[PDB]
Amino acid sequence: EHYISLLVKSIFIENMALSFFLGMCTFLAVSKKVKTSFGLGIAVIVVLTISVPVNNLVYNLVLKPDALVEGVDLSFLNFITFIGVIAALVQILEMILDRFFPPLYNALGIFLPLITVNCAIFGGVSFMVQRDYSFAESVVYGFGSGVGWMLAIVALAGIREKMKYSDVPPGLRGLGITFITAGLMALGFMSFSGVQL
Amino acid sequence: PHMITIKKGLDLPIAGTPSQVISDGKAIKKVALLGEEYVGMRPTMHVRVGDEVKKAQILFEDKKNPGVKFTSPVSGKVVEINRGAKRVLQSVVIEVAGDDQVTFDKFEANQLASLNRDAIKTQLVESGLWTAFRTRPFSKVPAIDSTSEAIFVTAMDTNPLAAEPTVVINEQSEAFVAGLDVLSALTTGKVYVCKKGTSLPRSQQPNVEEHVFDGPHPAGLAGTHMHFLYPVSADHVAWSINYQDVIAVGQLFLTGELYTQRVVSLAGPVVNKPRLVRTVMGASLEQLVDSEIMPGEVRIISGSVLSGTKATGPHAYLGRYHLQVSVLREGRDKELFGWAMPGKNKFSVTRSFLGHLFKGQVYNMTTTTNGSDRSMVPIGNYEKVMPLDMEPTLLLRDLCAGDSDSAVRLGALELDEEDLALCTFVCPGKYEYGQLLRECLDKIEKEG
Amino acid sequence: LKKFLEDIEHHFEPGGKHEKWFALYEAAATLFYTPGLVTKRSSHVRDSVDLKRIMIMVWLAVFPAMFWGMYNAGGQAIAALNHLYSGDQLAAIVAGNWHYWLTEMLGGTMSSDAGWGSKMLLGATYFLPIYATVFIVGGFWEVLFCMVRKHEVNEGFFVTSILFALIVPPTLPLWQAALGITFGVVVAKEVFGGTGRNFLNPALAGRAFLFFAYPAQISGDLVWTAADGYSGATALSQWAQGGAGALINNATGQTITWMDAFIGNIPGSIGEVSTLALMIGAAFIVYMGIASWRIIGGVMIGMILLSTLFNVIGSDTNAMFNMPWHWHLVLGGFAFGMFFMATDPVSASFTNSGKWAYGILIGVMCVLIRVVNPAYPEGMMLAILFANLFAPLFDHVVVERNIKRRLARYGK
Amino acid sequence: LKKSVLAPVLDNNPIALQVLGVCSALAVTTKLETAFVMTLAVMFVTALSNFFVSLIRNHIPNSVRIIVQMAIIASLVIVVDQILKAYLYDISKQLSVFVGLIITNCIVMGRAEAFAMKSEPIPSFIDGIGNGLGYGFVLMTVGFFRELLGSGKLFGLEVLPLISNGGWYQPNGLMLLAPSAFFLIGFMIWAIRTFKPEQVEA
Amino acid sequence: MSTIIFGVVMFTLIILALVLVILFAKSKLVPTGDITISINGDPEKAIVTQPGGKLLTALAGAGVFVSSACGGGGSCGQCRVKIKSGGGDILPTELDHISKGEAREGERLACQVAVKADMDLELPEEIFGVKKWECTVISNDNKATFIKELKLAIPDGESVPFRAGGYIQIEAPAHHVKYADFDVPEKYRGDWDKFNLFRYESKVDEPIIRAYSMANYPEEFGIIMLNVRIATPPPNNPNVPPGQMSSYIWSLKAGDKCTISGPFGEFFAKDTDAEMVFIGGGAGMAPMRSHIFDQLKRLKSKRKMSYWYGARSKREMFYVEDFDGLAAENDNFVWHCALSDPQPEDNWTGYTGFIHNVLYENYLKDHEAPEDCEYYMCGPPMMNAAVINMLKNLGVEEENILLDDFGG
Amino acid sequence: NDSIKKTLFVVIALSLVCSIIVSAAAVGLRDKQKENAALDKQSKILQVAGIEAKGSKQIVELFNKSIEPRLVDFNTGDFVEGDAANYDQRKAAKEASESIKLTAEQDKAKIQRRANVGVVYLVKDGDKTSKVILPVHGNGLWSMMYAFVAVETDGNTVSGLTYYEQGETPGLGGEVENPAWRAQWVGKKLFDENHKPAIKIVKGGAPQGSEHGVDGLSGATLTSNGVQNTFDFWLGDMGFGPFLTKVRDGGLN
Numbered sequence A: 001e002h003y004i005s006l007l008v009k010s011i012f013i014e015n016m017a018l019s020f021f022l023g024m025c026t027f028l029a030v031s032k033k034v035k036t037s038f039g040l041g042i043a044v045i046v047v048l049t050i051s052v053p054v055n056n057l058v059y060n061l062v063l064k065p066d067a068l069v070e071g072v073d074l075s076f077l078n079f080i081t082f083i084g085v086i087a088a089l090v091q092i093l094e095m096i097l098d099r100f101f102p103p104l105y106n107a108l109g110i111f112l113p114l115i116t117v118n119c120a121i122f123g124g125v126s127f128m129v130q131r132d133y134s135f136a137e138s139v140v141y142g143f144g145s146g147v148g149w150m151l152a153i154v155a156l157a158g159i160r161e162k163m164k165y166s167d168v169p170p171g172l173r174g175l176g177i178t179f180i181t182a183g184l185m186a187l188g189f190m191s192f193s194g195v196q197l
Numbered sequence B: 001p002h003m004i005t006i007k008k009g010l011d012l013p014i015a016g017t018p019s020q021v022i023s024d025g026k027a028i029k030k031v032a033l034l035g036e037e038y039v040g041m042r043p044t045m046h047v048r049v050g051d052e053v054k055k056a057q058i059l060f061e062d063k064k065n066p067g068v069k070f071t072s073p074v075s076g077k078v079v080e081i082n083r084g085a086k087r088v089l090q091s092v093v094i095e096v097a098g099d100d101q102v103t104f105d106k107f108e109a110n111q112l113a114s115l116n117r118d119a120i121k122t123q124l125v126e127s128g129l130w131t132a133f134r135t136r137p138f139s140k141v142p143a144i145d146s147t148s149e150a151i152f153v154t155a156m157d158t159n160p161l162a163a164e165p166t167v168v169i170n171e172q173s174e175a176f177v178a179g180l181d182v183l184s185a186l187t188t189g190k191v192y193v194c195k196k197g198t199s200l201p202r203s204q205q206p207n208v209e210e211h212v213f214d215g216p217h218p219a220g221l222a223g224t225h226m227h228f229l230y231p232v233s234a235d236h237v238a239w240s241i242n243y244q245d246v247i248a249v250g251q252l253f254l255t256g257e258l259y260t261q262r263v264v265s266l267a268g269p270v271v272n273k274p275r276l277v278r279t280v281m282g283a284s285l286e287q288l289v290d291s292e293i294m295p296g297e298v299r300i301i302s303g304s305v306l307s308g309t310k311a312t313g314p315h316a317y318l319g320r321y322h323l324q325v326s327v328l329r330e331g332r333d334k335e336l337f338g339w340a341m342p343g344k345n346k347f348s349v350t351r352s353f354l355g356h357l358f359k360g361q362v363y364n365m366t367t368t369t370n371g372s373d374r375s376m377v378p379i380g381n382y383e384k385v386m387p388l389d390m391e392p393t394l395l396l397r398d399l400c401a402g403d404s405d406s407a408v409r410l411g412a413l414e415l416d417e418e419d420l421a422l423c424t425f426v427c428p429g430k431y432e433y434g435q436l437l438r439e440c441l442d443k444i445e446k447e448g
Numbered sequence C: 001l002k003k004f005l006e007d008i009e010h011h012f013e014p015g016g017k018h019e020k021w022f023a024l025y026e027a028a029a030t031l032f033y034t035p036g037l038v039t040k041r042s043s044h045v046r047d048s049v050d051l052k053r054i055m056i057m058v059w060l061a062v063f064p065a066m067f068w069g070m071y072n073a074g075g076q077a078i079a080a081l082n083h084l085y086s087g088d089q090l091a092a093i094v095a096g097n098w099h100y101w102l103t104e105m106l107g108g109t110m111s112s113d114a115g116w117g118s119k120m121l122l123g124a125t126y127f128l129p130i131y132a133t134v135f136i137v138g139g140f141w142e143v144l145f146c147m148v149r150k151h152e153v154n155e156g157f158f159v160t161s162i163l164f165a166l167i168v169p170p171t172l173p174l175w176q177a178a179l180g181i182t183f184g185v186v187v188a189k190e191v192f193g194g195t196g197r198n199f200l201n202p203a204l205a206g207r208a209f210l211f212f213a214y215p216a217q218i219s220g221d222l223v224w225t226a227a228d229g230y231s232g233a234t235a236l237s238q239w240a241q242g243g244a245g246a247l248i249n250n251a252t253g254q255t256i257t258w259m260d261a262f263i264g265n266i267p268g269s270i271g272e273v274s275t276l277a278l279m280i281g282a283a284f285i286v287y288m289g290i291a292s293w294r295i296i297g298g299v300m301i302g303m304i305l306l307s308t309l310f311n312v313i314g315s316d317t318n319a320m321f322n323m324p325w326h327w328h329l330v331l332g333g334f335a336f337g338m339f340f341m342a343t344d345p346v347s348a349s350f351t352n353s354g355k356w357a358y359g360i361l362i363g364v365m366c367v368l369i370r371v372v373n374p375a376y377p378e379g380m381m382l383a384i385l386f387a388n389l390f391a392p393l394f395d396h397v398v399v400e401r402n403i404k405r406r407l408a409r410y411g412k
Numbered sequence D: 001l002k003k004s005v006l007a008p009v010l011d012n013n014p015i016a017l018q019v020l021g022v023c024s025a026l027a028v029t030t031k032l033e034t035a036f037v038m039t040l041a042v043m044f045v046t047a048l049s050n051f052f053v054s055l056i057r058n059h060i061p062n063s064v065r066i067i068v069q070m071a072i073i074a075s076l077v078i079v080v081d082q083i084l085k086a087y088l089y090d091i092s093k094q095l096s097v098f099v100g101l102i103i104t105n106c107i108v109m110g111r112a113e114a115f116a117m118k119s120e121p122i123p124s125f126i127d128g129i130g131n132g133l134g135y136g137f138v139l140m141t142v143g144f145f146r147e148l149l150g151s152g153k154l155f156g157l158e159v160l161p162l163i164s165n166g167g168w169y170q171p172n173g174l175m176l177l178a179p180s181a182f183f184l185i186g187f188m189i190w191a192i193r194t195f196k197p198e199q200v201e202a
Numbered sequence E: 001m002s003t004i005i006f007g008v009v010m011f012t013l014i015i016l017a018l019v020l021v022i023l024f025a026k027s028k029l030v031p032t033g034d035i036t037i038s039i040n041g042d043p044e045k046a047i048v049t050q051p052g053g054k055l056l057t058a059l060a061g062a063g064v065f066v067s068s069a070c071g072g073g074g075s076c077g078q079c080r081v082k083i084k085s086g087g088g089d090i091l092p093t094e095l096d097h098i099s100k101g102e103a104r105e106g107e108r109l110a111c112q113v114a115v116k117a118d119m120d121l122e123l124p125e126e127i128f129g130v131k132k133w134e135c136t137v138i139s140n141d142n143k144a145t146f147i148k149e150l151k152l153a154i155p156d157g158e159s160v161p162f163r164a165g166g167y168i169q170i171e172a173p174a175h176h177v178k179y180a181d182f183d184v185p186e187k188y189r190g191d192w193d194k195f196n197l198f199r200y201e202s203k204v205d206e207p208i209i210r211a212y213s214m215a216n217y218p219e220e221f222g223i224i225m226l227n228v229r230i231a232t233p234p235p236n237n238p239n240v241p242p243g244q245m246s247s248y249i250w251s252l253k254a255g256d257k258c259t260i261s262g263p264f265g266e267f268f269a270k271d272t273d274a275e276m277v278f279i280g281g282g283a284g285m286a287p288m289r290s291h292i293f294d295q296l297k298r299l300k301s302k303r304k305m306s307y308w309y310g311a312r313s314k315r316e317m318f319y320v321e322d323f324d325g326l327a328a329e330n331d332n333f334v335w336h337c338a339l340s341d342p343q344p345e346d347n348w349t350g351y352t353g354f355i356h357n358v359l360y361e362n363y364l365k366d367h368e369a370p371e372d373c374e375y376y377m378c379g380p381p382m383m384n385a386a387v388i389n390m391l392k393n394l395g396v397e398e399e400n401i402l403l404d405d406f407g408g
Numbered sequence F: 001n002d003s004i005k006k007t008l009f010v011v012i013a014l015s016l017v018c019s020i021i022v023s024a025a026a027v028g029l030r031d032k033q034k035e036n037a038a039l040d041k042q043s044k045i046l047q048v049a050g051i052e053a054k055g056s057k058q059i060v061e062l063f064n065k066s067i068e069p070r071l072v073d074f075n076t077g078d079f080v081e082g083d084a085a086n087y088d089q090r091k092a093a094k095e096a097s098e099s100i101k102l103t104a105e106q107d108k109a110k111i112q113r114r115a116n117v118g119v120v121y122l123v124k125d126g127d128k129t130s131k132v133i134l135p136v137h138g139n140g141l142w143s144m145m146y147a148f149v150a151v152e153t154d155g156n157t158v159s160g161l162t163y164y165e166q167g168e169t170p171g172l173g174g175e176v177e178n179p180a181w182r183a184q185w186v187g188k189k190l191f192d193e194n195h196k197p198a199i200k201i202v203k204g205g206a207p208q209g210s211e212h213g214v215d216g217l218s219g220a221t222l223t224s225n226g227v228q229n230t231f232d233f234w235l236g237d238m239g240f241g242p243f244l245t246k247v248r249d250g251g252l253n
C-alpha cells in the first residue's frame, strides 16, 4: 500500500543523514558511542514524528494560501512557524518526561536540548511542505525519516567503535577521520539512489 | 560424575613426550624464589646476602598484600639477590646446605575435616604454602582475611609434554586425600576437583566434588574449569591450586613439616631421555638439565611451551607454579621463500600446510616466530581455539587497542596469561596477547 | 643473495645513509628470505602460518580465473572483430591499435581461425598494462605512507591490486586505473592505518570511485568487449531489456546457454566471466580456512530466498523478476564477489553469529539492486559496501547478547 | 580588531576546529556561485542576529531564551530570503530549502548562545563577521575544487575545456555527488591540522 | 496594507501561543520549591536554597568551607564530597581527578556538580572543623632573598586543629600595590637593587584566594607562620603580571588584618617506623620544619630522618640553629644543608654543590637498602623533577613518593 | 528577575518589531519576485523559438510582441478561453478535478496524471503563426524531464527542442541539454504519411539524413527510452496529437 512504500522510501532511499546531509553536526559529534547514539536516535524520532504532523496541520489550516481567508496567503511565515513550533515541542517534551516519566527523562531528556534546532527536524518539515502530503502520510514520513536518520547515526557509531583498533595519523585523527568515514558511508548508501519507489 | 566435553581447542604434537615414569633425578645444589612470577608483588626483603636460612624461614614479605610470607624451600645460606631494571626483584638464590627446618602443628587424618578455619589459615600463611592459591579475577595471591566459596584443584594437565597427575598422585594417595579435607574445611562453599576420566582418590566430605573434562588442551586449564562450573567476576572471587601443591598441604598438616619435593616432566624435542624427575621447588634448571640435552643452541623453558618463563641468567630456576620443564631449539636460521613452501614438517591450526595431511606426525618445533610482527587480520583462527563462551576476535582487539573498560564487559576478568597462550600461538600477526592482558588487568586494579 | 642482503644491512640502518629507505628495504629482506626472529615471551612456539602465506595463497587462488579471463577477453575481441570487419578493412584496424598488431607481431593470428594461444595472448595485452599500472601506482602510495610514518609495509597489497585489476572492463584507460586504485589504497586503507585497521574493502572502494566518477568508461555496451566499434550488451543487461530468451551473443549470434555462462564464455570484465574457475579457486581458500565458509554460505542463502521470492511474486513489466536463482549465480560478478571479495577478513563481521547475518545481507542486497534498481545493471559491489557499513552492528548485537549472558552467570 | 576578527578564520574555524554549519557546506559547494552567495547570507545573518541579541541581551528571559533568539534569527532569514527571491533568483532555486536552514545553521545559533550573549553589541557584530568569514573560507576552497574538477568551470567560466565541447578534460562525476564533499573537508582539515598542530586531538 | 494586518496579528498569535504553553508547561511541570541538603543525615546540619548554582557555593554560604585551591573549573580536584544520592551523573572533567573506584564510592566535585534536586551527602566530621579566621599580622620580616615569613596571631588566642604540614587559604580583596612599598632589609636588598625589582606593581580587580603551607606544628598554640615566597616575574618575562598574592603578602606589615581559611592539607607524615628522607626547596622549608619538629616535639618519634634543603648562599640558608638544636636534642634525626653559590662573606667551609647531588653522595651513595625509605618532596619543579628521577635512578617506587607541589 | 508580566511584554515587543519588518518584505517584494519567475521561462520560450533576447527589458519586449499563450484541450484538441497567461499546468495535474488519471497501458510516459487543459505558445510573425511550442514532459531515469517542442504550421515538422528541467546524470544522461544534440533535432518529421507517431531514438547513431530517426544518447539507453516514450505519449491521442491534427488542417490558419 501507499503507507508501506512511503515508510521504506524515507528510511533507505531517502536518508536525511547521508542522502541530504541534514543534521550532520550532531551526526559526527554524538557518534562516539553506540549507546549514546541509540539514545539520540530515539530522541530525534519522537521529535520528528511529533513535529511533522503538527506542522502539517498548522500549514494546511492557516499558512496554506487561500486557506485561512480567501485572497490572502501567509506562506512567508513558513520558516518562523515551523521552527517556532519545533522549538516548543522539544522543550515541552524534555520537561514532562522529567516530571511524570523519570526513567524516560534520563534516557531521552539528556539529548533533547541539542535537538531543539537540529537540522534534521527542520529539514523534514521543509521537504514535506515542498511536497503534497496528508496528515496520515506525514506521520509515516516523519516516523520514516527518524528511523532512517537513526539508522545512519547508529551505523556510524558502530564503525567508530570498530576503529578503536585503527591507527589514524595525527591531525587527521578525531574530526578529520570522521568526515572521511562518513564520506565512505554515503558511497554504500548510494546503491538505492536509482530506486523510484 | 558430571562430565563436560570441550571441542574447540588445539593439541600441539611436539616431539619427545615424557616417558611418564618417575626417576630419581639429579642432585640440586642451588634453589631460588622467582620474584617476577608472583603478580603485583612488592618484596620487603627480610634477609641479606650471606644470611643463613631454614626450611620455612621467611625470605621476603609483600607490601601490597600484608601478612603473606614467602618462605625458602630448602635450608641453606643466601648466595645472591638479583635485581633487574628499576631494582625489580628477579630472584633470590639459595645454596642448599644443612638440614635445619621449622616444624608446625600436626593432626591426624580425620581431625582435618573439622578443623577451624582460622587455624588452617594461620598454618598455611606461616609455612608459606598460602602462596599456592591464586585469585582468578586477577591471578594474585589471596588476601589473608579474604575467603572464597570455590577452590579449584586442577588435577589434570593437558599442557604439551605435561606429566600425567595420575602417576604422581598414586604415589601420595594418602597425602592427597588429607589435602582435600583441609581445603574442604577452608572453603566456605565447595571444592571442585577437576580431573580427567581416570580414577583418583576421593574425599568423603560432601563439599569435595569431581568433574570430568575431556578434549584438547584448553580443557586442562583452571581458567576454563571456572568458566564451566563457577563463572567468576569482580564480586565473585575464586581460588585455584595445582594438584602438586595440594599434596604439599596434606603433608604439612599430616606431619607438621613443609613438603618441597616435586615431580616435573623434563621433556622436549631436544631432550635425550624425556621422563619425570623428582626435584625440589625452585630447582636450578641449569643443573637439572645438565648433561641431558643434545648439543647446540637451546632454550630452557620453565613450564609449558605455551606458557612459561625463559630460563636464562637470573631466571634460570623453576617457577613456583610451574610443574614442567621444556627444552627447545633456537630457530634463528633463515630459509629462502620459507613463507611459501610445501607444508611438510610444518604445523598449523589451519589446513594451509601439507603437514596436516600426515596424521599423527610430531614436529620438532623451534622458537622461531615463522614470520614478523604485523597487524591482526582475523582469518578465523581465534574462534577455533577459544572454547570459552566469549568473542575472542573482539576481545583480542580490545586488548590490542588498550580499551580496559571494554575488555571487562567482553569478559577479560576471568582470563589469565595462560588462557590466551593458544590465541597467541595462532595469531597471524604474531602478537603476544598474554602480555597485553597482564597490562590491561593491572590497569583495572590500579585504577578501578 | 643472503650474503649481499646481510652486508647491505649496514646502509639501511639508522647509522648508515639511506635511512629514509629502510621501510622499502625491509620489504625485500622480509620477502626473499624469512626473518630469523625468535619468540621473546608468551608461547615460545608459534604457528607456521604468517600474514605473508595468506596473501600469496589468495593471490594464487585467482590465477585460474585470471588465465581463463584473459583467454575469454581475447576470444570475444577476435570473434567480434571478424563479425564487424573483414578482408582488407580488418588489416587497417589491426594496424591502428597497439593491442592488435602487437599480438600479430608475436605470432598470434587475428583471423577467425585463431587458436587458444593467440586468443590468450590478446587478453594479456589488455590485462597486464592495467595490472602493472595499479601495482606501480598502488604500491607507490603504500610505500609512501609507510616510509613517511616510519612503519613496516604490511603484506596486504598484492591481493588488493590483483582484485582491482580483475573487476574492471578490459577497455579501461590506464589513467583511470591509477586514480581508481589511488582512491582505494589511500582514502579507504592507508588513511585508517593500513591492513587490518580499516572497515571497508579497498578494491571495491577503488572501483566504486570509477563507477561514479567516470560511469561512461565502466558502463554501457562499448566497454565490455575489446573490439573497436563493437556495441554488445552483457548477459545481465540483455535480460533486463528482454527476457530469458533475449540472451544472444551478437558476435557469433548464438544463444547464451547456462553452461556457457557457467563456464564463462560471455562478455564482461576479466575476473568475473568464469564461475567454474572461481569455484575451483575459491574451494582452496575456503578449504584452507583462509576464507570463511559462513559468509559464503550466508550469501547463498540470502540470494536464494530473495531470488525465489521474486519469482513467486512475478511481474508483467519487469523481466528481471522471473530470473531463477541459478541464473543469478552465474551472471554478473556475484560469483567473484561472493568468494574473493565478500570474504575479506577485515571488512567482514568478527563474530561467528555476525558472519551469517553479514553474509545474508549481501545476498539480499545484491539481488535487490539487480531487480528493483534499473539505474545500475548489477550491484554486487554496492551490495558489499552496504554490508560492510552494517557489519559492525551485526557483531555488536551479538556482543550485547553475549554480555547479557555473562552478567547472568550463564544461568549458574 | 584585524587580528581578533581574522582569528577564527583558521585558528577556530567553525567547521574544522568546531563542527557547526556543515550541512550547508556539503550541499551548497556544488557550484562556486551558490557557495559565495551562501557565505554572504550567513555572514550577514550571523552579524545582525548577534548584534540584536547583544543589544537586548540584558532583558532576555532565561525561561524562553531560545525562542526570542530564534525569532530574531528566523525573521532575519525570511527577509534575506525575500531579497534572494527578488534578485539572484537563479541562485535562490539552487540553494533550495537550505536557505531556510540558515535559521537552523549551528553557526548562527551557536555563536548567538556563546558570544552574542554576555558581550557588548559592537564586539558581537565583529565576531559574527569573523565567524562567517572563516566558515566561508571552507566553502570556497571546497567549492573551488568541486566545481573546478566536477565540471571544469569557475563561476560559470570555462577553465578546462570539456570533451563534450571539443575539449580535453573529462568531468569527474563524483565531484557533484555526496561523497566528494566529505572527502575534501576530511582532507582540508588534515592540511590545517598539519600547519597548526595546536588543534590536534589526543 | 490589507494582508499585512492579517500577517501581523497571526505573527503574534503563533508566537504568543507557543510561549504561553511552555510558560504554562513549567508552571505545572517543574517545582519551584527550595532544595534541602542534608549533611551526615544531621537535622541540625541542613541547608536549604533555591535551585541554581553549584554545590560549592551553597556549602560556603552555610559556613562549612571546602578546599577551593583551583577556585572551581574542575582543575585541582581537592573538593571531594561523598554524595550518597542525587547530584546527577559524573562529568568527564570530574573523572580527571576521580577514579572509577572513587566515583563508585560516591566522591564528587562539589565545584562542578550543579544543585538541581533534593540530595543527601556524607562528609567526615573533620570538615566541620574547617573555619575562617581573621588573623592579625604579627610581623612579615624578610628571611631570604625571595622568601618571607608571615607571622599571624589567631584572634582570642585559639589554635587551629591542624596536622603537621597542612596549608591554609588566604583571601585578599581587590587592591593595588607597588614593589617600592615593600620593606626589604638591606641584608637581602643586594639582589633586589641589582635587578631593580622595585619597579613592578601589582593590581588586583577581584578577590583572590591562594593556598599556603604553615610552618608551625599542631602543638604550637596561638600563632601561624607562613614562608611565603615572592613570585616576581621571571627574568626572561620581566614585564609580565607580577605575582598578585605574593606582592600583596610582601606589602603587609605588623597589625595587618589577614584572612585565612582552613585547616587544609594532605601532606601528612605516615605512621610507620621506616626512615623518612625530606628534600626541601624554596618555600617548601615550612612543611619540613613542621614534620621534623612534630616528629620530635609532639610525636617524640625516635625514627631516623634525613632532611636536605637546597639554597644559594648562607643568607638563603635559614633555620640552621633551629634544626641544629634538634640534632643535639635528637641524634636519631639528622639535618643538613647545601650552599650552591656561597658568597665571599659567607665564609662557608662545609658542603658544596647542589642539594640533590650532595645528599646522595654522603647518605644514599653507601645506603644498603635506601629503597624502603619514605621520600617527601617539596621544592621548585626542577629540584623536584631532578630528585624524582634521581630517586628513581636508585630504583625507587612511586607508592611511598609523596610530592608536595607548589606549582612553581 | 523572572516576572511573568515582564517576560510577556518583551516577547510581544519582539514579535511586533519583527512582524512589521517581515510583513513589509513579504508584500513589498511580492510583485517583483513574481516577475522574476515569469521572466526566466519567458527567456526559455524565446530561446527555443530562435528569437535572440538578452536583458530583462529585451525579454519583456520580444516576448510580448511575438509570443502568445493559448489554452488547448487535450481531449478535443481545440482552443480554450481562460487565464492562459497564468495557467499553472503543473499544479492543475496535481488537482484531481483538473487532471485525468492514466491507466497502465495509457501511461506510456510514466506520468501519474495529465491536466485536463494544456497551454501552448504560438510564435506569431507578421500577424501569422509561424510555429507553435508544445510543453511536453516525460519520465527520465532519475527524475521528470520537461522540454519544449517547436512545430511548424503543418504540424509535422520539428523546428527545435530544448529541455528546461532535467535531473539526469551529467555526461551520460545530461546530454539532452547538449547544444549539438538539440540542434540535431531540427528538420525531423513528427508523424509519418499515415498520420501516426514516427519520431524514433535509434541506439548507436542514426542513418544520415533520416527524416524520423534521431541519434540516441551514447551509453544512456535508459534516458533515451524515456525521451522516446515522452514523444510517443504526447504525440498520441492523450497528448497534443488531436491538437496537431487540427494544426495539420490549418487550425492555426
Ligand SMILES: Cc1cc2nc3c(=O)[nH]c(=O)nc-3n(C[C@H](O)[C@H](O)[C@H](O)COP(=O)(O)OP(=O)(O)OC[C@H]3O[C@@H](n4cnc5c(N)ncnc54)[C@H](O)[C@@H]3O)c2cc1C
Pocket (backbone or CB within 6 Å): E069, E167, E208, E210, E211, E212, E213, E214, E226, E227, E228, E229, E230, E231, E232, E233, E234, E237, E240, E241, E242, E243, E244, E245, E246, E247, E283, E286, E405, E406, E407, E408
Ligand atoms: C597546596 C599549595 C600550597 C602552597 N603553599 C605556598 C606557600 O607556603 N608559600 C608560597 O609562597 N606559595 C605557596 N603556594 C603557591 C601559591 O599558590 C602561588 O603559586 C603563589 O602564592 C603565587 O600567587 P599569585 O596569585 O601571585 O600568582 P600569580 O599572580 O598568578 O603569578 C604566577 C606567576 O607566573 C607569572 N605569570 C602570571 N601570568 C603570566 C603570564 N600571562 N605570562 C607570564 N608570566 C605570568 C607571575 O609573574 C608569577 O611569577 C602553594 C600552592 C599550593 C597549591
Ligand SMILES: Cc1cc2nc3c(=O)[nH]c(=O)nc-3n(C[C@H](O)[C@H](O)[C@H](O)CO)c2cc1C
Pocket (backbone or CB within 6 Å): B379, C054, C058, C156, C157, C159, C160, C161, C163, C189, C194, C195, C196, C197, C198, C201, C202, C203, C204, C285, C290, C291, C292, C340, C341, C342, C343, C344, C345, C346, C347
Ligand atoms: C579471503 C580474503 C579475501 C580478501 N579480499 C580482499 C578484497 O576483496 N580486496 C582487498 O583489497 N583485499 C582483500 N584481501 C586482503 C586484505 O584482507 C585486505 O587488503 C585488507 O582488509 C585491507 O585493509 C583479502 C584477504 C583474504 C584472506
Ligand SMILES: CCCCCCCc1cc(O)c2ccccc2[n+]1[O-]
Pocket (backbone or CB within 6 Å): C027, C030, C031, C052, C053, C055, C056, C135, C139, C140, C142, C143, C153, C154, C155, C156, C157, C158, C159
Ligand atoms: C610493490 C609493493 C609495495 C608495498 C606493499 C607490499 C605488500 C606485500 C609485501 C610482501 O612481501 C608480500 C609477500 C607475499 C605476499 C604478499 C606480499 N605483499 O602484499
Ligand code: FES
Pocket (backbone or CB within 6 Å): A022, A023, A024, A025, A026, A118, A119, A120, D019, D020, D021, D022, D023, D024, D104, D105, D106, D107
Ligand atoms: S548546520 Fe549543524 S546540524 Fe545542520
Ligand code: FES
Pocket (backbone or CB within 6 Å): E067, E068, E069, E070, E071, E072, E073, E074, E075, E076, E077, E078, E079, E109, E110, E111, E112
Ligand atoms: S575546587 Fe578545584 S576541582 Fe573543585
